Amino acid sequence: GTSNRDWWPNQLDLSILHRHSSLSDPMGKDFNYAQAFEKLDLAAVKRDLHALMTTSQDWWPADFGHYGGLFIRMAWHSAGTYRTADGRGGAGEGQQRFAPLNSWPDNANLDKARRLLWPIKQKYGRAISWADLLILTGNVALESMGFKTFGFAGGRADTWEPEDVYWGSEKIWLELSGGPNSRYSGDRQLENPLAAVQMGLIYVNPEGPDGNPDPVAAARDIRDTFARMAMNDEETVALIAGGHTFGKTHGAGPASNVGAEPEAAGIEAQGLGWKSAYRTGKGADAITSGLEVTWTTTPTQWSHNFFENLFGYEWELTKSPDGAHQWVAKGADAVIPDAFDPSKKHRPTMLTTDLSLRFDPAYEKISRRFHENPEQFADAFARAWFKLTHRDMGPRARYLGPEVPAEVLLWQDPIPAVDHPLIDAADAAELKAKVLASGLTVSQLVSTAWAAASTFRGSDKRGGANGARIRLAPQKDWEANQPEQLAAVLETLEAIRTAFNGAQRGGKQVSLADLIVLAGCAGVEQAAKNAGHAVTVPFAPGRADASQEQTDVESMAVLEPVADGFRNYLKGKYRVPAEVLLVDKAQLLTLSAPEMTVLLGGLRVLGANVGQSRHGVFTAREQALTNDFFVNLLDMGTEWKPTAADADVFEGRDRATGELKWTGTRVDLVFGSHSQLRALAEVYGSADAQEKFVRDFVAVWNKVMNLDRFDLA
Amino acid sequence: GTSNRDWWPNQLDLSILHRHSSLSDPMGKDFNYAQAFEKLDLAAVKRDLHALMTTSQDWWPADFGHYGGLFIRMAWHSAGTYRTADGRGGAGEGQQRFAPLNSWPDNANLDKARRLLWPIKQKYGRAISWADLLILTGNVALESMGFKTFGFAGGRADTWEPEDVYWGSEKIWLELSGGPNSRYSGDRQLENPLAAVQMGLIYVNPEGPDGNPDPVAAARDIRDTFARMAMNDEETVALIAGGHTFGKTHGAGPASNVGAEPEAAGIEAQGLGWKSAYRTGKGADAITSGLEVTWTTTPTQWSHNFFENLFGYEWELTKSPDGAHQWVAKGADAVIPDAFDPSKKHRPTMLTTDLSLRFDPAYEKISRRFHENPEQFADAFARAWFKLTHRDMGPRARYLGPEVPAEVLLWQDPIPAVDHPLIDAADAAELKAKVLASGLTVSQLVSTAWAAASTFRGSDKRGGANGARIRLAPQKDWEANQPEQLAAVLETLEAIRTAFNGAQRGGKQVSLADLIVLAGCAGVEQAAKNAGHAVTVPFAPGRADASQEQTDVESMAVLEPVADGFRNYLKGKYRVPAEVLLVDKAQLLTLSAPEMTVLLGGLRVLGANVGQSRHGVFTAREQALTNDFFVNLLDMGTEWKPTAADADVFEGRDRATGELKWTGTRVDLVFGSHSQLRALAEVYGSADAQEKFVRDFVAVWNKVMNLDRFDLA
Numbered sequence A, B: 001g002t003s004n005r006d007w008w009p010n011q012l013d014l015s016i017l018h019r020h021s022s023l024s025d026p027m028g029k030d031f032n033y034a035q036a037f038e039k040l041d042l043a044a045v046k047r048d049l050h051a052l053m054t055t056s057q058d059w060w061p062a063d064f065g066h067y068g069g070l071f072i073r074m075a076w077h078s079a080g081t082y083r084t085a086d087g088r089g090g091a092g093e094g095q096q097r098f099a100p101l102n103s104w105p106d107n108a109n110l111d112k113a114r115r116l117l118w119p120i121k122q123k124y125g126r127a128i129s130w131a132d133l134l135i136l137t138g139n140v141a142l143e144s145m146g147f148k149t150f151g152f153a154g155g156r157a158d159t160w161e162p163e164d165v166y167w168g169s170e171k172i173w174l175e176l177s178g179g180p181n182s183r184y185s186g187d188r189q190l191e192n193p194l195a196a197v198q199m200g201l202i203y204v205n206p207e208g209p210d211g212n213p214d215p216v217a218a219a220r221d222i223r224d225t226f227a228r229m230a231m232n233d234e235e236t237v238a239l240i241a242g243g244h245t246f247g248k249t250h251g252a253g254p255a256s257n258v259g260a261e262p263e264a265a266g267i268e269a270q271g272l273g274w275k276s277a278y279r280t281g282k283g284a285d286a287i288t289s290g291l292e293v294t295w296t297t298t299p300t301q302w303s304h305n306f307f308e309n310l311f312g313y314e315w316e317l318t319k320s321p322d323g324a325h326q327w328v329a330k331g332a333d334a335v336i337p338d339a340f341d342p343s344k345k346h347r348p349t350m351l352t353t354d355l356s357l358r359f360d361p362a363y364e365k366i367s368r369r370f371h372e373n374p375e376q377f378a379d380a381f382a383r384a385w386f387k388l389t390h391r392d393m394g395p396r397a398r399y400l401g402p403e404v405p406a407e408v409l410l411w412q413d414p415i416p417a418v419d420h421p422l423i424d425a426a427d428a429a430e431l432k433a434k435v436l437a438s439g440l441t442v443s444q445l446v447s448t449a450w451a452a453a454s455t456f457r458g459s460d461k462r463g464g465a466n467g468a469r470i471r472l473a474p475q476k477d478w479e480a481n482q483p484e485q486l487a488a489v490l491e492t493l494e495a496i497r498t499a500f501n502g503a504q505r506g507g508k509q510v511s512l513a514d515l516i517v518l519a520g521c522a523g524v525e526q527a528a529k530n531a532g533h534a535v536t537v538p539f540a541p542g543r544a545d546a547s548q549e550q551t552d553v554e555s556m557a558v559l560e561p562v563a564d565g566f567r568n569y570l571k572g573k574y575r576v577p578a579e580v581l582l583v584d585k586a587q588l589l590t591l592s593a594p595e596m597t598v599l600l601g602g603l604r605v606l607g608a609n610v611g612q613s614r615h616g617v618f619t620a621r622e623q624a625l626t627n628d629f630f631v632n633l634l635d636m637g638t639e640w641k642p643t644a645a646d647a648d649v650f651e652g653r654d655r656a657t658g659e660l661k662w663t664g665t666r667v668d669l670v671f672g673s674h675s676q677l678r679a680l681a682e683v684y685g686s687a688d689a690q691e692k693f694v695r696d697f698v699a700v701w702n703k704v705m706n707l708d709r710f711d712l713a
């Protein structure tokens, strides 16, 4: 069946904006997962999980009689797809059960782990999501084996279809670097937004970089990929040594024995894959990665034996039964247990990437400190495991249940509690009137509130106007935010705020976070008024102001908009067309095609463009909220041509006279070009659409203002 | 960006079931187009369209000063994608403005026609859809040029994204037959469901079959493709000769001059394509098909000149300025006007496919009758033009506005008016009790009402339970409908109906159409009771019984379900796997993936399978409405393997014992295989879901029972 994607493989793809519709969701329109989970008996689930760890199923027998290691791995892979660049991946939507992740080679045999959990999923039904369950099971595994976790939060709602994520351009699973779709260039520079060394891997190659077993050079890939998952050196050592305190790898026989991954398997396989022809195909004969390493003398118990071994022996290169490179301690006694035969013991073994922890000079200092002080190791791994498994969950307001840790961590971008009465509707009207009387313009008001709110991304639920981080480093200095104009606006708003708070009785006060958003509302209302329309923009107070000390400047860097088509802004020259970056930003902001369309056409005529550019400002009444963008864009009396100086800027000229009327960018003109976007623009550019345009603009404006307001959920 | 489609190009694609969500739709959830159109001033629209006909724009100057010909073509292409096999295509959704149809070669320069209509669309806004407007414009073109149309109905709501339609497998535009993805096999057999000879054509190649200028062999393609668009010989001759009474073709220079189609054109083209480097690129120099033919001496006026020319001259083969085959009149004078130069005239010309109307023996008899009796030609073309442009609109109850023809036509599958009081809630309870007391089983009741209602298809809105056509030829004889069992159920129902109607006072009576559906409802109620649930199934009366004379048996044949996964039925072996045909049927029935899932799992346990097959009957309490299908399908204690005798049938055996528990087909097992469908199955197979299952089943049941109920819309 030949498709549009085949005929026009470079057209913009809008279907990413309409995933996760009510059509695909089996739960009713009013189903609220938070409410279901809040009544779950979490202790009873955990008791069932605890029992499961030692209840072996014959179709996938438990190593050492304990599934703990398999489930830690499952839970680390669920969380380990996360990329700080865009917030995509991570455990927060249970995407390991869908394509492509369910069939990545690094997820081999995790289908078995998920199937072992079906009886418990089934028992508790909608009260616990798959997404939550994968992580909870990892925690219970750790607890059952003697490790004290840092806590657990529920609240990850299930999704019902694959997310659209750019995982790379390679067309071959696990393809070595330097091919025609190489994710590397320069001196081993991995392209953004990617966070793994090869297609279908979580982070790095366990044999070493493109299979070269050099622990020193493997360390470089480890450090780079972990950093791209937001983990520093201490957290990376803790997590890798922590995880490899448990279980074993599986490489009993040659990998040519292993059949089709789950999405390619026969229907009879009932969602499982990697069926193996090697001996029994499972248990003692299991093949997963092709490596055959067991790290500790007690694989089903927390210990400090990973570092005891790593430092206590000298290591020699050897090959597994699939020919993969790995390491053995030859001077050692056979002290490591066999997973199925009580009369067999084995020498200690390590992966190339484990030895990275000892032979990279920076990691060795951390590993030594953890070796000498296993209490510090345990605390670091607990904190890192929590961060790993929660990093994409959003503000603490989304955390559910009785085990949420009370310690507030800097990586959570914390927001102080509000301990005072909020402004009411009358107070909000008085504040809007003072904002408008200060002389701040519609353009300034709208640009500032847009700049504060539009940092939100739905992928990990970071960003948004809550916190007033726009006044702090680094957001106050981001080029897109127009640092000098921003500073002038914030100074006037802060004087309004000081006066208003100073006049109050009884504890009432307004945060700068709320006032920045409310001021933006007043600019939209004024713009509507300038066009002859009386509207009220909704506004919900309750944001609080975060301090500079509560704001990790380096972690904020990924939220900088380097492309924001809603402000006609491109920080530099990119390989990806500007219109594709626009749909990418729309997806992160959780907007549908119609909402992206209304919003951008309004922002254009309100003066939200960076630098006061005229590109796309197709109106003679700037700062009035009208549908002028669409009416003028779609006017066939105007002819458009790329400029001689810049092919990404277009001149719109009267077709008869040649007079220059407008200029625009690819972001502006795609609304007149793309067949679906133009059909949208036509709705808003029709003679009967002034009221609809205004109402829909206000609704999406309000939606953007509230994206991070999980305190009102 | 490598996608799931790339890695697993044969996995089942469910996104076709979630197209047309509220996310992609710019209108609000409550927007009702029928109500908007009912308030449009249609007379005012028509006046503006009349004015447009002769308001020539310099960017696409009107031939002969009159756009009429261009617009008739536009309207005929809008309607001309329709295939009777599946009901897909046609004018009813305005799909000509989206990919791929906006860029098919046969739609070249229809982008210009649609852009000429933007000022009018804009003026009237949401009150007239693009889909209605394309057809109305056709009609007005005809009227402006002196032809009285048979009428017009509004009510085609606009859609907002491309429909998923199989248009063929060729990867080259216009590919000639016998390639690696050939749509032809055998003795020129066109594959179902296709209705055109080459990818990107409406019906046939105007030069002749695969470009061979043989009018007799072209006739064969014309007859086959037109039949596959529901037109017989009389209607086909009328439409081709009627249409070619107007306008001209465009082939002024070589086609190498013509650039990118709209979906491939640069952004500055603003949604237009086929920009030509030949001379002015437009008007006198236009290139569209590459042929250069003008049929009549008055191309802007209705006349009888097409058949005068066809028969009045002998024809000689020649070549257009692009090298295409076409025909010129032997020894004729230059009598045909030039489209732009009043001092030029041309000899009469014809397409190969025009000459088919004279050289095919069956067409020649019709064409001669129309030549001798122009009033018969005029009436047949008016009727056929109405059929062409309304064939996919569905029942007459959907037709809006003041120009709807009062004559009821066979092709509309008409349903008699209801002229009598309907049964009320008391009467429905009494009828259900009589149904249940007759001894009809749950299986019989549910299977019969399924068979009656599930013929509906949303593509052209044909089919459904209204009319009671299940009791008529050919539906009563369809293998899927189990003719002998069906007859015995209809006999018992008809006795119940006769007794009930016989006892009424006033004119109250129930239709057999209503009673079939009501009886199905009673079976669902009884099934719920068998499972210990108290359930009332909604029922809406008002269906009427159609007669055999109101039921075209040959046109009904396309509605026969040859694959119906909801009854585990496959009439033969097909190229397409059975799970693909299931999702196809789900689409035609307007079901989302969750509705398809719930519905099939219920039907299985209610005994709706054809032939009482056990395949997928995963319950020990058949005829009880439970979620057993899901709970048993997902039981990992059961292992599935294909049978020796049939690889499309599977045995489910206890994994420990080897005992045979179940058998299933690919339709059954795909719910335990495909990662998205299995996620749905898991919701319904959870311990907390029996109530949700029952409720969701009754909702989708009722949906299916009401699919054709446009009288309640």
Ligand code: HEM
Residues within 6 Å of the ligand: A063, A068, A069, A070, A071, A072, A073, A076, A203, A204, A205, A206, A222, A239, A240, A242, A243, A244, A246, A247, A248, A249, A250, A251, A287, A288, A289, A290, A291, A353
């Ligand atoms: C440089 C980073 C890492 C590399 C290259 C890596 C590599 C691997 C490989 C190749 C396996 C064997 C898979 C099999 O054949 O069955 C495995 C097992 C495992 N890994 Fe990792 N690992 C990494 C980090 C982590 C982290 C961060 C955790 C958790 C905190 C983790 C926990 C585990 C566990 C528990 C197992 C054992 C599986 C079982 O017992 O079935 N690893 N690792």
Ligand code: HEM
Residues within 6 Å of the ligand: B063, B068, B069, B070, B071, B072, B073, B076, B203, B204, B205, B206, B222, B239, B240, B242, B243, B244, B246, B247, B248, B249, B250, B251, B287, B288, B289, B290, B291, B353
């Ligand atoms: C065998 C079926 C048919 C064939 C192969 C066919 C072919 C064509 C072609 C090749 C053109 C020239 C396009 C161009 O270069 O601009 C055209 C024009 C047109 N056809 Fe057809 N046609 C068919 C049936 C129809 C029908 C059913 C109608 C309407 C009832 C229709 C009405 C028109 C009209 C009005 C034009 C003229 C457009 C103008 O003046 O710009 N034809 N046809």
Ligand SMILES: [Cl-]
Residues within 6 Å of the ligand: A088, A089, A090, A093, A095, A163, A164, A165
């Ligand atoms: Cl994601």
Ligand SMILES: [Cl-]
Residues within 6 Å of the ligand: B088, B089, B090, B093, B095, B163, B164, B165
């Ligand atoms: Cl369609």
Ligand code: NA
Residues within 6 Å of the ligand: A087, A088, A089, A090, A092, A392, A459, A460
């Ligand atoms: Na994410």
Ligand code: NA
Residues within 6 Å of the ligand: B087, B088, B089, B090, B092, B392, B458, B459, B460
């Ligand atoms: Na259709």
